Amino acid sequence: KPSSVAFWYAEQPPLAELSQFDWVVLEPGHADAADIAYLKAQGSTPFAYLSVGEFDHSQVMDLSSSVWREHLFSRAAELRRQGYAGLFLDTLDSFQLQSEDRHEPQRQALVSLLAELHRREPQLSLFFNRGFEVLPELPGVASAVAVEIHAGWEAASSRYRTVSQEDRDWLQPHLEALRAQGVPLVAIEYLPPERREEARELAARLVKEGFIPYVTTPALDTLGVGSLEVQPRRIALVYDPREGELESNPGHVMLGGLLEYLGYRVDYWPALPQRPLKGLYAGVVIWMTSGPPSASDSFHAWLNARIDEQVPIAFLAGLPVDNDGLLQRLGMRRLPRLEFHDQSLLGAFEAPLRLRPALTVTDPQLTQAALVLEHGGRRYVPVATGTWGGIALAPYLVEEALDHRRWIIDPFAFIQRAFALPPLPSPDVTTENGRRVATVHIDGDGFVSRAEVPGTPYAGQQVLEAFIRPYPLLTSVSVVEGEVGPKGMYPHLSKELEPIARRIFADPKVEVASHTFSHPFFWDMRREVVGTRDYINQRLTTPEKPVKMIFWSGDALPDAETIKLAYDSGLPNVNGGNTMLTKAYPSLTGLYPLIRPTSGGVQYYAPIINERDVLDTFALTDQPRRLRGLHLYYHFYSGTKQASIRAMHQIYAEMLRQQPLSLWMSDYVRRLEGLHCASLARRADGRWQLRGLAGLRTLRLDPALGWPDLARSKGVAGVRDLPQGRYVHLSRADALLALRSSRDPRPALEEANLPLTAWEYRSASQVSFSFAGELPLQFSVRAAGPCRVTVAGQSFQGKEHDGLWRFQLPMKQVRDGQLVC
C-alpha cells in the first residue's frame, strides 16, 4: 500500500526527486524506458496514465465497443511490457455525459471492460480515478482510488477554486465505503505554485483526514507537495550562447563549483523550460553580459514567470533586461564616491572595494542596496537583494586582471541571501567516513619517453617502480595506444612497451583506463573511444580486469556525441577544467566545477589539475572550506626527470600524512554521480530522505540542523565534527536522516579507512556493521564506555584516545561485525 504518490505528465521528469515518492504516475509518451528503469531502481513504482472513457477536444468512446475495448486491452499489455507496474485509469465517469437511457448500458460495459483488463493483466496494479459507479461491482480490483477534496481546479473558468461543501457531501459516502474496504484514497488537489505554504498545510490536513495528498498544478508539470515534500536541491544557471559556449562561460567556470560545494545540483540552460520551477529549483542564476536574447519578449516573459511563482533570480555580472516594467516590479530603474555598503555581502571576502552601471533603486521596500555609489549627484546601486533575488553587476562582482580574478562580493553570502537558502545536509564528495578522499590517476602521455636517470628506462617502468609499487594508494592508470601498440607511432617499441603496461595493470593497486589512440590535443571518435578500449582489453589486461574508464586527452572538451559514445561503450569519463589555487594566487575563482553536463551525458572534470602549485591547491581546498579531496593527477612524463620525480615524492608524502581514504577513480566517479543526481526530501516524521546518491555516502550537515539522531535514523553510522564541516557518514544510498539538537551519545562511527557497507543499531549499545576495501580495516568510535568489536568468533578491545575507541582489524572486509559499548 502506498505511503506517497506523485503525478508528472510533462516531459523531462525529474527522476531522483520523483523517486522520493512510493508511486509515480507518468504520461507514457512523455517518458522513456530509461526513466521507468531508474524509478524502479530507486524503489518507486511507476504507473502509466490511461484514459478509459475518452479518446484525445475529447471523444466519449463506446465502452461496449469491441474496437475500443481491445484497443485498451492492447495498450495495457504494451505498457506492462515496457516496464510499468500499474495503470492510472482516467475518464471513468465520462459515460454519464450520454443520455440517461444509455447510462446503465455503458456503466455495465465499463464494469466488464475493467474486470477483463484485470483478468488479462493481473500483474498491473489498477489505480482508479474515481469510478464510484463501477467499483461496487469490482471488489478487490482497485489498488487505490484518486479523487480530484479542498482545493480544486475548474477547467471551464481556468481557475483555482475552493471545493464546495456540496461537492464534498456527495463524495463522502463513496469515500467512507472505500475506506471500509481498506482501499487507499489519494486526494489530488490544485494550488498555484506560489501558494506553496498553503499547500503544505493542506497536505497535513488531508493526511489527518485519512488521505494520501498530492497538491499540484492543473498541467501536472510541477513537483508537488505530498505526504512528503521534496527539498528543492537544484540551481539553474542561464547563459547567453552568443557570448560563448557553456564551458567558457564565467558563471560555469567560477561559480558552478561553489554551488556544487554549497549543496546543489546545477542545471545549465542557454529554449528555457516552460513549466514552474517552484518545488524543484531553489533559484536561478543569470550570467549574461550582452543584453537580452534576440527573442527578448519570450525571455522577459520567462523571467516574469519566475518572479510571479517566487523562484528567486540572481543577475550576476550583467543585467540582460530591456523592460522598464520588469525593473519596476523589482523596485529598480535605469538612470564615483562611496556612500554605503553591506560588508556582509562584499568588500571583506577577497578583493577590497575599489571605485572604478546606470541602475538605481526606486523602492527600498522591494530591493535593499548592498552598495550605493554616487556620481554626478545621482545614487547608483550595482549590488542588491530582495525577496525576488538579487543583482551583483560588474565591476563590483569580480576584480579582473590578465590571468587573475578575485571575488569582490562574498559569493556564498550573496547566493544564500538572494535565494534565502535554507540549511541542508549537503551531499559532499571530499570526505568519506570522516577522512579526506584520495585519488591518483595517470594519463598515458610520455609512457614511451626515456627517463633522464641512470639506465634510461622507459617512463612506464619508472612510474611503476618509483610511485605505484612503493605507496599504498589505489591508482587508476591509462595508456595511449598510439604510444604502446603495434598500430601506433612506435610499432617497433611495442614489444618492449606492452610488457611494461601489462605489469602495471596487473599490480593489485591499479585499475585500467584508456587514454585514447592519438591523444587529440583539441577535441575518428569510434577509433579513439572504442578501438583503444578493445586494444587494451585484448592485449594488455585480462577479462577480469578490463578498462574501467576513459581519460580525455588535451583540452578534454569532447562534444556531447563523443561523451555519449563513451557511455555507450561502458566507459565513464574524467578530465578537463583547470582547478588550481596557489599561495601566490589563492582566490576561490580558481576553482572549476566538478560536473560538466551535456545532452550526451555527464563529463566529470579533473577535480584538481595536473602538472608546488599542487601542494598549494590541496591546502587551499582543505581550509577553511574543504572544496576538494586529495586528487593527484599526472602524466608518465613526470617520471622522466629527477626534479619532477623529486616533486612527485613530496606530493605523495603530504597525501599520506593526511591519512586519507583511498579510492580508485572509477569508484570516485560514482560519488560524483551522486553529487550531480542526489535529491533530498522532508518527511512528515521530520526525517530527511535520500535518493539518487549512487556511490556518495557523506552529507555535510549544516550546524543549524543539529546532529544525527542515531536512535531514529536508518543507514546513518556517525559524524565527525571538523573545522571544515559536520560530516555525517552513510552506510547506504537510501538513508533516512533523523536529527536532534545535541550530539547523540550512543556509539557512533568517527572515522574509518575503508568504505562502509552496513551499520545497524540493534540497541543503544550494540551495532552490526560491515566494511569492504583494499587495506586492513582501521576505524574509531565515539562512545562513553569501553568498546569491543567481535568479528568471526574473535574479539578486539578498543584502545582509548580522547573520547574515541580505536580499532585495527587484520582483515580487508568485515561482514556483520558486532560493536558493543
Numbering used by the authors: 27 to 82, 106 to 197, 199 to 320, 324 to 388, 396 to 416, 421 to 587, 615 to 702, 717 to 926
Quote the original article.
A major biofilm matrix determinant of Pseudomonas aeruginosa is the partially deacetylated α-1,4 linked N-acetylgalactosamine polymer, Pel. Once in the periplasm, the large 948-residue protein PelA modifies Pel using its two enzymatic domains. PelA's deacetylase domain selectively removes acetyl groups from the polysaccharide, rendering Pel cationic, while its glycoside hydrolase (GH) family 166 (GH166) domain hydrolyzes Pel. The hydrolase activity is required for the generation of the cell-free form of the polysaccharide, which is important for the biomechanical properties of the biofilm and P. aeruginosa virulence.
Herein, we present the crystal structure of PelA from Pseudomonas thermotolerans (PtPelA) and show that the protein has a unique four-domain structure. Diffraction data were collected for selenomethionyl-incorporated (SeMet) PtPelA at the National Synchrotron Light Source-II to 2.1 Å, and the structure was solved using the single-wavelength anomalous diffraction method. Structural analysis of PtPelA reveals four distinct domains that align well with the AF2 model of PaPelA (PaPelAAF2; 1.6 Å RMSD over 816 α-carbons). Upon analysis of the PtPelA structure, we found that residues 293 to 498 form a mixed α/β domain with 12 β-strands. In our crystal structure, we were unable to model residues 588 to 614 and 703 to 719. Modeling of these residues by AF2 in PaPelAAF2 suggests that these unstructured loops are important for forming a 23 Å-deep, 44 Å-long binding groove. PtPelA also contains a 14-stranded β-rich region comprised of two distinct regions (residues 793–937). Combined, this suggests that the β-rich domain could provide structural stability to PtPelA and facilitate carbohydrate binding. When submitting the structure of PtPelA to the DALI server, only structures of the isolated hydrolase or deacetylase domains of enzymes were identified. These results suggest that the domain organization in the full-length structure of PtPelA is unique with respect to experimentally solved structures. Using sequence analysis and enzymatic assays, we found that PtPelA and its homologs define a new class of carbohydrate esterases, CE21, with distant homology to the CE4 and CE18 families.
